[PDB]
Write a protein that binds this ligand. Structure first.
Ligand SMILES: CCc1nc2ccccn2c1C(=O)c1cc(Br)c(O)c(C#N)c1
Length: 515
């Protein structure tokens, strides 16, 4: 009297699971928007130093001679490496001699300049306001954007662990509902904080609650369906993220103020919390705990939804108790973690799987948060990453059965990897080729997440299936944290952030051939 018999009795495929899939895949879009909002709410616009001659109208009325703004800009700001007015320093004493062309304007000492003690002036053509504009994340404070992104990712990790324990102890639907509420409230609060550390802390809390939402949605979606229909709903969950990227691009185009954007993104989660109550709790977990009457209630409700009351009429507590007894025990938790690495055969298999899990977080999140440097129109780039993800993800699974198993993993990492390395070599003059390659790079890098998830289970023995995936997700989260921090190497050179992000997938993909 195992649970699958009962689930087949009530109805495994019809109606109810479709509605549940809709109601649980809709929030994934807004989860993706919350995750990728940092690309728009923290965009760094073009800026230059504050100059009394230009910015101040009181000094504007005192200008001797009607000189054009370009001449004043050349006078007051030293030239920069890219022929632009240099960003982080200013002329002390209005240099009039620069007007004359008789002197080669190249002999300038570092003692002739001062740091911008009077703030900056930013460009407001595209973005009305970001966090960089508000709190002056410029010059000496340019290292605090990857800090914010790493704090958010660490929040995801800690929230995943804590919510895992809490959902294993209390249930699925309850933790999911309270996670919806926490996301909404924490986002609404974060949209109003005046100082940077408060913003970082509330983004941390939002990330924790988001991790809880994703985990509980995945588990509750898996536990209510027959084993034949698992990968189909995994594919639906995967497509949710691509539609979420498209939605992120659209909403970012709609609103161009970071506080309003954050409020608009964090608003619907309260609505999700409101109707999260009507969902039924997973019957398998209810059977495991020992509250049989609640299990019978959920089973009868979901059977009545599918119009299968006649088969539900025969359900009694005895078969539920038999299913309780048949459920395997998990006392072995302390044992499988060591056995994964202590086994000589399993030591190498895990590590290469670990390295493949590591490479996804390091490369994808290090680049998907820096679309400003890969092109001009970041509204269009966000849409295309979601668009290209659809044909590639579905088109890849065809090659699984035909081209084999071990070859798919190697191609799923090398080929997106070489797209990024080609971005360095190609001249910046051909911008269209630069942008199209980056779309195909990160667009095809998402297919690695799906292929590895499916392949992880089949290799390992049935005993250690769950624990093997548990390690794999940890390296993805731990690797993603180190992603943004690499951008701090950009001071040495422009090509260094791209070089490291391209070498890791090539080594990860080629090393997977030993599996
Ligand atoms: C914020 C998560 C996220 N944002 C995007 C944006 C585009 C494509 C995919 N994602 C994801 C994930 O798929 C993902 C990452 C890690 Br790290 C996890 O631990 C889990 C879990 N559980 C899920």
């Amino acid at each position: 009297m195992a649970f699958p018999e009962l689930l087949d009795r009530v109805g495994g495929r019809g109606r109810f699971q479709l509605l549940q899939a809709v109601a649980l895949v809709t929030p994934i879009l807004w989860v993706t928007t919350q995750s990728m909002l940092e690309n728009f709410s923290a965009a760094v616009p073009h800026h230059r130093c504050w100059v009394p001659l230009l910015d101040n109208s009181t000094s504007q009325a005192s200008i001797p001679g009607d000189f054009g703004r370009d001449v004043l800009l050349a006078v007051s700001i030293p030239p920069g490496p890219d022929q632009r007015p240099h960003q982080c320093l200013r002329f002390r004493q209005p240099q009039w001699q620069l007007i004359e062309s008789n002197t080669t304007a190249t002999n300038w000492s570092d003692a002739d300049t001062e740091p911008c003690e009077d703030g900056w002036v930013y460009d407001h053509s595209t973005f009305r306001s970001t966090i960089v504009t508000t709190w002056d994340l410029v010059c000496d404070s340019q290292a605090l954007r990857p800090m914010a992104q790493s704090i958010f990712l660490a929040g995801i990790l800690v929230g995943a662990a804590v919510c895992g324990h809490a959902s294993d102890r209390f249930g699925r639907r309850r933790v999911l509902t309270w996670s919806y509420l926490l996301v909404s409230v924490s986002g609404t609060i974060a949209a109003l904080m005046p100082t940077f550390p408060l913003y970082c802390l509330f983004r941390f809390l939002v990330a924790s609650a988001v991790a809880g939402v994703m985990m509980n949605t995945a588990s509750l979606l898996m536990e209510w369906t027959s084993a034949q229909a698992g990968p189909l709903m995994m594919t639906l969950n995967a497509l949710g993220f691509s539609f979420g990227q498209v939605l992120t691009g659209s909403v970012a185009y709609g609103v161009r103020s970071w506080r309003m954007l954050q409020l608009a993104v964090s608003a619907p989660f309260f609505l999700f919390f409101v109707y999260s109550w009507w969902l039924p709790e997973s019957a398998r977990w209810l059977i495991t705990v020992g509250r049989l009457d609640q299990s019978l209630r959920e089973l009868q409700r979901v059977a009545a939804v599918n119009r299968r009351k006649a088969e539900a009429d025969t359900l009694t507590v005895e078969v539920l108790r038999s299913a309780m007894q048949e459920e395997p025990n998990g006392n072995q938790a302390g044992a499988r973690l060591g056995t994964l690495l202590h086994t000589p055969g399993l030591r190498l298999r895990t590590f290469i799987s670990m390295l493949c899990w590591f490479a996804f977080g390091f490369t994808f999140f290090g680049l998907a948060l820096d679309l400003q440097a890969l092109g001009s129109n970041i509204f269009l780039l966000q849409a295309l990453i979601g668009i290209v993800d659809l044909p590639v993800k579905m088109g890849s699974l065809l090659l699984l059965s035909r081209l084999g198993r071990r070859l798919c993993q190697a191609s799923s990492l090398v080929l997106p990897g070489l797209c990024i390395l080609a971005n360095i070599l190609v001249p910046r003059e051909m911008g269209i080729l630069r942008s199209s390659l980056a779309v195909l790079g990160l667009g095809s890098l998402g297919a690695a997440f799906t292929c590895v998830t499916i392949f992880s289970s089949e290799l390992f023995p049935t005993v250690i299936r769950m624990t093997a995936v548990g390690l794999g997700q940890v390296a993805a989260r731990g690797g993603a944290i180190l992603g943004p921090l690499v951008r701090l190497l950009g001071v040495y050179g422009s090509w260094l952030p791209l070089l490291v992000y391209g070498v890791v997938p090539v080594l990860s993909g080629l090393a997977a051939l030993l599996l």
